[PDB]
């Protein structure tokens, strides 16, 4: 290993449970600590430790194969996958938030106070008075209501920039990744 994976997992704990964070830190030794040896050292309940290890295994962080022999859980910390897993997690996340941004720009735009029946901007001809100028609802000629939200007045959002900034430590740590090792 190298400082890459050390700092990486150290900052990766920040997402999952801090109870999982202590267990991840126990990978300080790559010695592949066994489940019962972990009960001796981590001492978390066998059920709590089992749940925690399984949750840490599911996201492809670590891999375990207790053989048979007392049985010895083949604990691990698969670092080669770790980097790709974190990259895909942010890769999907950056996509989901940008799509949420763009998909939030569409709305009916109009309403009637009574009858609460949004129409569309396209209904202007039906929802209008040749004379009075105020847009009036079809089955209640008493509408005045314009837009509950006018439009994306602000820039894209503070949400996207907030993700950009709160993750600048993660971006910088993946810049420290910088492919230190060309191995498998």
């Amino acid at each position: 290993p190298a400082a890459l994976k050390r700092l990486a997992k150290y900052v990766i704990r920040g997402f999952y449970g801090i109870e999982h964070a202590l267990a991840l830190d126990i990978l300080i030794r790559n010695s592949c600590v066994k489940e019962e040896d972990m009960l001796e050292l981590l001492k978390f309940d066998r059920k709590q430790l089992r749940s925690v290890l399984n949750n840490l295994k599911g996201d492809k962080f670590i891999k375990c194969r207790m053989r048979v022999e007392t049985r010895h859980n083949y604990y691990f910390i698969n670092y080669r996958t770790l980097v790709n897993v974190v990259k895909y997690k942010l890769d999907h996340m950056r996509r989901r938030i940008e799509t949420d941004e763009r998909d939030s720009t569409n709305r009916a735009s109009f309403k009637c106070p009574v009858c609460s029946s949004t129409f569309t901007d396209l209904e202007a001809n039906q929802l209008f008075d040749p004379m009075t100028g105020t847009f009036r609802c079809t089955f209640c000629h008493t509408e005045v209501e314009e837009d509950e939200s006018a439009m994306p007045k602000k820039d894209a959002r503070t949400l996207l920039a907030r993700f950009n900034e709160q993750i600048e430590p993660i971006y910088a740590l993946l810049r420290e990744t910088e492919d230190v090792n060309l191995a498998y």
């Binding site: 901007d121 396209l122 202007a124 001809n125 209008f128 008075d129 040749p130 100028g133 105020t134 847009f135």
Partner: protein
């Protein structure tokens, strides 16, 4: 745009019309419903220039009616998105301009109107004028509007007028 195209339409002729003058009865009936009704796929239909052919009458079992498929040529008008067409202003209002293009009627929202343009409520005839009065838009005036999109309902099509594009409005 004014497009002369052939349409496929069907006629339900009551048996009471059978006998003398059955063929021109179908021709006469065809004009009754085609004229005055519109469809989004083809737009407003103005007139039927001629009938290309008359199809065989298919009898519906139990109903007793007849189905005549008729090929006829007619001119249609359909607004297209992102095109500029001459228009006439019908009524002028603060929250929107209503303009008519033949059978087609278009509504222009206040937002689509240029920012420097303002409604003239004080003037007895509702109209929009500028501070310098360089350009004035009033009822029954020639203006060009860009169609943002084509939207239809109840066999009627009315779009939005956009004046942002250059070389639009009265001259």
């Amino acid at each position: 745009m004014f497009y002369h195209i052939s349409l496929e339409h069907e006629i339900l002729l009551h048996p009471r019309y059978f006998g003398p003058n059955l063929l021109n009865t179908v021709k006469q009936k065809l004009f009754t419903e085609v004229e005055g009704t519109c469809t989004g796929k083809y737009g407003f239909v103005i007139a039927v220039t001629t009938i290309d052919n008359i199809g065989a009458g298919v009898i519906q079992p139990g109903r007793g009616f007849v189905l005549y498929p008729v090929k006829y040529k007619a001119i249609v008008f359909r607004p297209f998105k992102g095109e500029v067409v001459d228009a006439v202003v019908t009524q002028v209002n603060k929250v929107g301009l209503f303009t008519e293009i033949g059978p087609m009627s278009c509504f222009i929202s206040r937002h689509s109107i240029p920012s420097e343009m303002e409604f003239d409520p004080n003037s007895n005839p509702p109209c929009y004028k500028t501070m310098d009065e360089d350009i004035v838009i009033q009822q029954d005036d020639e203006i060009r509007l860009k169609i943002v999109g084509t939207r239809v309902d109840k066999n009627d099509i009315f779009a939005i007028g956009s004046l942002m594009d250059d070389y639009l409005g009265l001259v």
